[PDB]
Design a binder for this molecule. Structure first.
Ligand code: HEM
Ligand code: HEM
Ligand SMILES: Cc1cc(N)nc2cc(-c3ccc(OCc4cccnc4)c(CN)c3)ccc12
Ligand SMILES: Cc1cc(N)nc2cc(-c3ccc(OCc4cccnc4)c(CN)c3)ccc12
Ligand SMILES: C[C@H](O)[C@H](O)[C@H]1CNc2nc(N)[nH]c(=O)c2N1
Ligand SMILES: C[C@H](O)[C@H](O)[C@H]1CNc2nc(N)[nH]c(=O)c2N1
Ligand SMILES: [Zn+2]
Lengths: 411, 410
């Protein structure tokens, strides 16, 4: 069953056959679409089917499907599952798996880079202090004095679900957020709950607007522990605007390394509950979402004010005009400081090229239009007119609930 | 099955039960979502009466006469008519309810807060294209209302056996012509190049300008279509200037005030109305974002940025975004200056959230298509962006139908 998608700006039509290899359900039923819904414990019983599927996929990619090395590996994985209930990936399989988890991430516009992921095997790690050391080295490697490099660090896999490794932070590098008694928020409103958890665990909060949060790290199902990332490893960029000299006086800055750490990596039925991964920012992620979203820093007002815009009626498009300016500032500051960033025009262009190539050589590219389209200027980017098919392929990155909602506390 | 949608900007959560009434299918499956595909959209006495029953059931419930005197009488009365005529006719009251609820169910429409204020013109007594033309001119004049725009629909006779279809071949009642060039690309409007050819190739005398209002191509009772020029005095147009940039009027841009879609199919109680032009008023971005800046369209961003002396050497300077905002500021400014109704995307999306609020409270749900509701600029600073939505097809409904020239047995 072949399916077509059309690019309504170029009349380019592509044929998807890769969705046939889809297994996991999407959330949409025959009579309802949940395409805009944000978020729509494992035994030996179902594991070897998942292991076999992954291993078949793996050996196909190395052109050894049905070879002796392939059959022996299936045999080997079979025996380790029946006697030990789980199994261990080889280094070759872990790297393939983590790369393809990114390749399958249908909400990720930066996937042209998927094959250049640097995979750090941290499966020998046993303690929170060891996690801290592995994460420090990830940050240093990935930052690279501003010449960012994609990397993932993979901590031991779930076993009985009672000894999970978890990074409790949602990203390795994030700014604290403090609810004030008067209802206002100091710093990043997105992190107020996590900040309070950190303070409750004994973090001495400087209580500033741009405080790097501590790491809160759980090894082998134990209670989490706090660690301060060495400040010389946290690369930050002061935000200034090329034409407006008053923009620096807003005193804004942002960190250079986007590194997401709350997600789960699934490979061959194995769940890696601790797997921080990092890339480089698309400019709108900082400029549009992190600063202007009503539930974030909310600087549109002050920017529009200092720009002297008609703020009385929204039909002056003062909000639109301030947002563009803030996003020019973000791009200008990172480029000026020689820290890798990509504008939403370059990144969406690259993704169309990626997507067409994936249809050419893979037969499909799962894509979530609701997420791929940038949050500003959507229709003047080439992905807006591009039809996309969303479906779930494994290996995959999955959501998992926040650990503090599930963790059984030791003390 | 009793699903919930969250707004991630306010944490408001709404429960949807209306989706359980969803009749038609969405084109998604459990293994694959098609929420971004543009178009996944000869009846019989068998399928017809249940469709009629379901419509009349929700109609008589709406007037709180469910299970009553008139309800049962109408049900058998229509049941008698279908068995005897292989179709049936809608009472005026049901026809109005049917049309208002097709708008209400249009899950891609951000302006549905106005759904109940639709003016319905019953043109089912129409028999000829000239008659069609008279009805359309009156529609245009009523809806334009000297710039004080009023929502309206005009409903021509329903399909009978598919050989007697009434069709408006134009995609909109009012649209600028598009002429391909022997040398470069396109002059006029590229969206309408084919239709502009089919007009000339049908008889039209094109002034081959940049803003030539297309004639109407009207087909009655399945006959060959006829050309008609809309009287110029009824086409209200807004010349586009900018409140800061004197050179902006030098671009020689204008746009018409009335958005009036004429190629969709209205389905009520199983009856198909293949000609049902409907109109409201524009959202600002529909003119300045889509109609003026797409590579598929006018693509004037090139020259606006030049006239702003922006750094077009690299995309990372965001000159397209800068020019894009200025174009849409001008469009709003121009329409408002001339007192022609228009809404900005901040106001229309905030209105829509309140509408969603009302539909979940007083109806249990509101089918919504995020891909189409979120405006094509500044998406995440409008409140629809953080609003989870549920997309499902309810009837009565507006539906896509094939372009007639590929279908009409000429
Ligand atoms: C290197 C440059 C990269 C860029 C510019 C980039 C950009 C983005 C953006 C803009 C989003 C949408 C999220 C939002 O805007 O709120 C996204 C989603 C995502 N990215 Fe990438 N990304 C990059 C690399 C990576 C890497 C290295 C990984 C993993 C190894 C990754 C995995 C994902 C996943 C899993 C999602 C969606 C998560 C979900 O389902 O909610 N990305 N990316
Ligand atoms: C009164 C002011 C109205 C406004 C501001 C408005 C706004 C919009 C917008 C922004 C879209 C998306 C199209 C695009 O952006 O390219 C849309 C689509 C649509 N509108 Fe509304 N609209 C209005 C009136 C009406 C009326 C009176 C009807 C019918 C009675 C209607 C039915 C529809 C339908 C059926 C669609 C989508 C068709 C499809 O499924 O593709 N609208 N409208
Ligand atoms: C490697 C990488 C690079 C980059 N440059 N960018 C990235 C963005 C995400 C990402 C994933 C999910 C997200 O969503 C979280 C969420 C879920 C539910 C409710 N709220 C928020 C967000 C933020 N939107 C970002 C993940 C990885 C990214
Ligand atoms: C009454 C009304 C008022 C308004 N203010 N606005 C409206 C916009 C549309 C509309 C419907 C479908 C559309 O889609 C065109 C299309 C579909 C499939 C293939 N090619 C092209 C578009 C343009 N995007 C607009 C329809 C009605 C509108
Ligand atoms: C690919 C996508 O489905 C298509 O281009 C849609 C996207 N969203 C849209 N949204 C609106 N309002 N109008 C449109 O024409 C479109 N086009
Ligand atoms: C409800 C809606 O799905 C939600 O707000 C999504 C929409 N698209 C998005 N797209 C990106 N890139 N990032 C986001 O956080 C979101 N949020
Ligand atoms: Zn779907």
């Amino acid at each position: 069953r072949f399916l077509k998608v059309k690019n309504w700006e170029t009349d380019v039509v592509l044929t998807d056959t890769l969705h046939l290899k889809s297994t996991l359900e999407t959330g949409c039923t025959e009579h309802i679409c949940m395409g805009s819904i944000m978020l729509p414990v494992r035994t030996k019983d179902q594991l070897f089917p998942l292991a076999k599927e992954f291993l078949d996929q793996y050996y196909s990619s190395i052109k050894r499907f049905g070879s002796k090395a392939h059959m022996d590996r299936l045999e080997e994985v079979n025996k380790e599952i029946e006697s030990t209930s789980t199994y261990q990936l080889k280094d070759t399989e872990l790297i393939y798996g983590a790369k393809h988890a990114w390749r399958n991430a249908s909400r990720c516009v930066g996937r042209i880079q998927w094959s250049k992921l640097q995979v750090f095997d941290a499966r020998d790690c046993t303690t929170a202090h060891g996690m801290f050391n592995y994460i420090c080295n990830h940050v240093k490697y990935a930052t690279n004095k501003g010449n960012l490099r994609s990397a993932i660090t993979i901590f031991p896999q779930r076993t009985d679900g009672k000894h999970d490794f978890r990074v409790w932070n949602s990203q390795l590098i994030r700014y604290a957020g403090y609810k004030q008694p008067d209802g206002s928020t100091l710093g990043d409103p997105a992190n107020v709950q996590f900040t309070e958890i950190c303070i409750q665990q004994g973090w001495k909060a400087p209580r500033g607007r741009f405080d790097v949060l501590p790491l809160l790290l759980q090894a082998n199902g134990n209670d989490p522990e706090l660690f301060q990332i060495p400040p010389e490893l946290v690369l930050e960029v002061p935000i200034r605007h090329p034409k407006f000299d008053w923009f620096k006086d807003l005193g804004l800055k942002w960190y250079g390394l986007p590194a997401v750490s709350n997600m789960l990596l699934e490979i061959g039925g194995l769940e890696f509950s601790a797997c921080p991964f990092s890339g480089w920012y698309m400019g709108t992620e900082i400029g549009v979402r992190d600063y202007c979203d009503n539930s974030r820093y909310n600087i549109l007002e002050e920017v529009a004010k200092k720009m002297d815009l008609d703020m009385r009626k929204t039909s002056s498009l003062w909000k639109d005009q301030a947002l563009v300016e803030i996003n020019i500032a973000v791009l200008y500051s990172f480029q000026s400081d020689k820290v890798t960033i990509v504008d939403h025009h370059s990144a969406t262009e690259s993704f169309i090229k990626h997507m067409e190539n994936e249809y050419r050589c893979r037969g499909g590219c799962p894509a979530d239009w609701v997420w791929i389209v940038p949050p500003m200027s959507g229709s003047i980017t080439p992905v807006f007119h591009q039809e996309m098919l969303n479906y779930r392929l494994t290996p995959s990155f999955e959501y998992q609930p926040d650990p503090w909602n599930t963790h059984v506390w030791k003390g």
